[PDB]
Write a protein that binds this DNA or RNA. Structure first.
Ligand SMILES: [Zn+2]
Ligand SMILES: [Zn+2]
Lengths: 146, 272, 279, 275
RNA sequence: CAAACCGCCUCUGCCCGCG
RNA sequence: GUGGAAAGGCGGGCAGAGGCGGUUUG
């Protein structure tokens, strides 16, 4: 559906957008094609709104640090998982604007996939959020937003 | 014809990124430790590229000291697309022009090619220096382990001259002051001319120390400094007995223009 | 048919799956270096009077392959598909369970995987002054992870215990043929027992290169020579394995070759019973 | 004759990236798994080249220890295109010139061909080392099964000296820090030659510490590093009876320079008492 | 208690030599 | 009494040239 993201796709791709998202209130929801299948529809109706794109890469660098700590970097891979929660809303706690409604389709999917990691595996239980974190960015570039 | 071997002068030390240091790939990083590094390709090809133009300027003033510089005359071979003619920059790589002598007996007397080596058809001269990859020092492994930033993301812009419309981009560069540990091995294949090769390598090091290394450079992204540790000699009998029979030059607090010379290398002269 | 099975767990790539002619030569060169001259002749006498070894065949993780008898080609239609009949005739090595099937002229299955690969690596020769190169290519047998090669031994046990078992510990650190200074023919040796269920008939497939003393029934011809202390051996017509003789004991042949010692070429048979069709 | 086989084991550490190639330039890899490896020929011939150059420097100073280096003048036979005219690198294989001796009894006294092997005509002195093929240490197969990259892809460029035009190519290099596991099996054929052969082999290894191993070495692709585990003597009686008679020297934390002098008077005192 | 934008483009991306 | 013996896929090649974090707000 390359022609979807039409102008009413915000009023079309929010049929069940947050229900199954809140049903994925842990990280390891479903290893299958449901990850990519959810990750397309998440970015499918962000694109009709603004979604200022390049305010994400601090989480990318932080996941790189935690991934170096997967590669025998540090034994404590707990503090950087909490530092994302320290920076979870500071962005919408800094300045607002036109693309805030897409942030309404971004903040509701944070705490389902962010309150999990206190008693989690540090190396494991992490790759599926790590895949949803990139497939949304990827298909959002592919629909034409960046 | 006649490759010999007397020993191997080893140059060790540190490379000080006095300003930021860009070598693109995002700066390169080795896949295992994850830290950035300097390759030896990026460094040999920048000592060479400077000593090239140094020879090209003095191309007529040396041809009684270095023969087979008589067979060149300055410039590129781009305004007449031939391989080997009277011009100095006589090899096409892909679409660009670079001086490599085409034979063994021609390149044995080239000052560039007896030190950085050459190639060719039906003859080949191989190098005398080995320029190894330069990883971060012992201090900066741990400054990385203590949580510091080893790289930065710098943001630049491009301004329209008429309306001041500006257009940003992001570079990613090693932070200033970062220090990499290098090694350069000159393989003493002739005891007649090792002074000239060590002195030409120091000329290339000095010209690199006034220019940049990688990256934009004309905008500040270079500025490498060479902090010397040890010239060593490792003669032909170090490798057989194993005993510490190698001559060391004491230069732990000197400049690349301060080595360049008779006072330092006197025992290497006497050891021949 | 209870045979000792010698397994050659490879440490590198072989040059070729060793024939019986280059297993026996390797054993003789081992015995002449750990025992002496006068104990190679007792080895040869033990193989004249008694024992026999077979060729090497590939194994892959506790499945042992044996060559296909040629007894199944003339009556592969009476066993039985034209695709199956063609792939059932092309194939070279049958599994031990299938091989015991096909000795009795029963329907059998071919393995769907070969345990090695004939790969040719490019090498180079560099002169020492100019580093100026010259390629040639080199073929070798590169094995999988659990796969390797093995051969079988019949005969008494003092010959195995005094000659072949020391010869296999010697040849593990100097290989079976090929560029063995590149670490090619090397292996770790370990011995088991194999039992083969075989019909007691007049006809026998040979599991080693035959070099017969009379014409066999169905055969697959194989010229090969060798190299014995630098001297070229003349090309000899062995029969390849899996071929049907009747009551043909084979025969070793002594060569001349201009050496301090005679050079035997192992031309003995390794009989297993087989059931033929009417021709 | 034969008196046993000395087995040298240990590890190689690719301190910088290791590149060999498989004819946008791949490295050579095992056709079944897909992991890289260091060939035995690529290691052996690099050792032989290094020791050839070392010997060619010393054709005047070893004429009394090793005879039949008196038959050679230091140089090469490329200009005067007659093989074994009298220079050292005397045999032409295809287009390059190697020192390979032409006979048995001249190569029993030449220290290169006594160890690495000669070919000749009607004669053929075979080698006396087996440089066994080198595969990744099981730690680095476990790192390969953790999804970690075992090779990289390094982009280099060539640049016009006047107009600074990029002309890029890529090479596939093994990740720096890798570990391979080597074995070198020396064949004790004559009990006089053994000290000098193992000293020459360790000299050839120690020239390789300061040289490189395959690929663009002067652009920083070698820096191999030998980390020994143990030697074994494996005597003649071991292959006869199969007990544990083999002397195991232990040098677990020693480099090839710490091994040539430190252990050769001391860690081989047990082997000279058995010859 | 920061309003608004711009958040990468332009060019090459394996060759000469052994069989 | 080994289709063997001997043989470094390697020499040379800068991820580089160009580009104000900037325009308006007492
Ligand atoms: Zn030149
Ligand atoms: Zn020799």
């Amino acid at each position: 559906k390359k022609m979807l993201e039409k102008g009413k796709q915000w009023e079309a791709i929010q049929p069940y957008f947050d229900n199954v998202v809140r049903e994925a209130k842990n990280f390891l929801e479903w290893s299958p094609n449901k990850r990519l299948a959810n990750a397309v529809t998440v970015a499918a109706y962000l694109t009709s709104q603004g979604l200022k794109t390049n305010q994400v890469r601090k989480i990318l660098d932080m996941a790189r640090t935690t991934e170096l700590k997967v590669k025998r970097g540090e034994g404590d891979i707990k503090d950087d998982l909490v530092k994302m929660r320290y920076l979870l809303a500071y962005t919408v706690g800094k300045a607002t604007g036109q693309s805030k409604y897409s942030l309404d389709a971004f903040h509701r999917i944070l705490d389902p996939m962010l309150e999990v990691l206190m008693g989690s595996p540090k190396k494991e239980n992490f790759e599926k959020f790590y895949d949803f974190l990139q497939a949304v960015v990827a298909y959002h570039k592919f629909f034409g937003g960046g | 014809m006649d490759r010999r071997f007397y020993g191997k002068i080893v140059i060790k030390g540190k490379i000080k990124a006095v300003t930021g240091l860009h070598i693109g790939s995002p700066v390169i990083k080795d896949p295992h430790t994850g830290l950035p590094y300097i390759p030896g390709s990026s460094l040999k090809g920048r000592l060479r590229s400077l000593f090239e133009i140094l020879v090209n300027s003095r191309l007529g003033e040396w041809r009684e000291k270095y023969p087979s510089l008589a067979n060149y005359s300055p410039g590129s071979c781009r305004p007449d697309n031939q391989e080997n003619c009277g011009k100095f920059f006589n090899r096409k790589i892909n679409r660009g022009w670079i001086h490599v002598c085409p034979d063994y007996e021609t390149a044995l007397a080239c000052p560039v090619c007896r030190l950085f080596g050459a190639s060719g058809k039906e003859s080949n001269f191989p190098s005398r220096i080995i320029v190894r990859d330069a990883f971060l020092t012992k201090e900066w492994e741990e400054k990385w382990r203590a949580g510091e930033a080893i790289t930065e993301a710098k943001i630049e812009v491009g301004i329209d001259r008429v309306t001041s419309q500006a257009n940003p981009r992001t570079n990613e560069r090693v932070v200033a002051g970062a220090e990499f540990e290098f090694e350069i091995i000159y393989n003493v294949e002739n005891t007649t001319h090792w002074r000239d090769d060590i002195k030409n390598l120091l000329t290339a090091m000095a010209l690199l120390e006034d220019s940049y290394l990688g990256g934009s450079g004309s905008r500040g992204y270079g500025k490498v400094k060479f902090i010397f540790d040890s010239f060593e000699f490792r003669p032909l009998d170090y490798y057989r007995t194993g005993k510490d029979e190698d001559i060391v030059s004491i230069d732990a607090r000197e400049k690349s223009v301060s080595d360049i010379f008779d006072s330092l290398f006197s025992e290497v002269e006497g050891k021949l | 048919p209870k045979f000792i099975a010698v397994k050659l767990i490879p440490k590198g790539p072989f040059r070729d799956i060793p024939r019986a002619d280059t297993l026996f030569g390797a054993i003789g060169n081992a015995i002449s270096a750990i025992h002496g001259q006068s104990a190679v002749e007792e080895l040869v006498d033990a193989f004249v009077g008694g024992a026999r070894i077979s060729s090497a065949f590939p194994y892959s993780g506790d499945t042992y392959y044996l060559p296909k008898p040629l007894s199944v080609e003339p009556a592969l239609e009476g066993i039985l598909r034209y695709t199956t009949a063609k792939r059932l005739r092309k194939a070279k090595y049958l599994d031990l369970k299938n091989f015991e099937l096909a000795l009795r002229l029963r329907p059998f299955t071919i393995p769907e995987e070969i345990p090695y690969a004939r790969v040719d690596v490019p090498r180079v020769v560099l002169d020492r002054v100019t580093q100026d190169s010259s390629i040639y290519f080199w073929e070798e047998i590169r094995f999988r992870e659990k796969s390797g090669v093995y051969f079988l031994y019949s005969g008494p046990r003092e010959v195995f215990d005094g000659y072949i078992a020391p010869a296999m510990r010697f040849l593990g650190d100097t290989g079976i043929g090929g560029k063995s200074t590149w670490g090619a023919g090397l292996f770790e040796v370990e011995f088991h027992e194999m039992k083969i269920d075989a019909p007691g008939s007049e006809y026998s497939v040979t599991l080693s290169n035959a070099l017969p003393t009379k014409t066999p029934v169905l055969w697959r011809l194989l010229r090969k020579g060798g190299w014995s202390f630098g001297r070229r051996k003349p090309r000899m017509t062995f029969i390849a394995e899996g071929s049907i003789v009747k009551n043909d004991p084979g025969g070793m042949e002594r060569l001349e070759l201009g050496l301090s010692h005679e050079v035997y070429v192992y031309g003995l048979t390794f009989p297993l019973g087989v059931e033929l069709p009417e021709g």
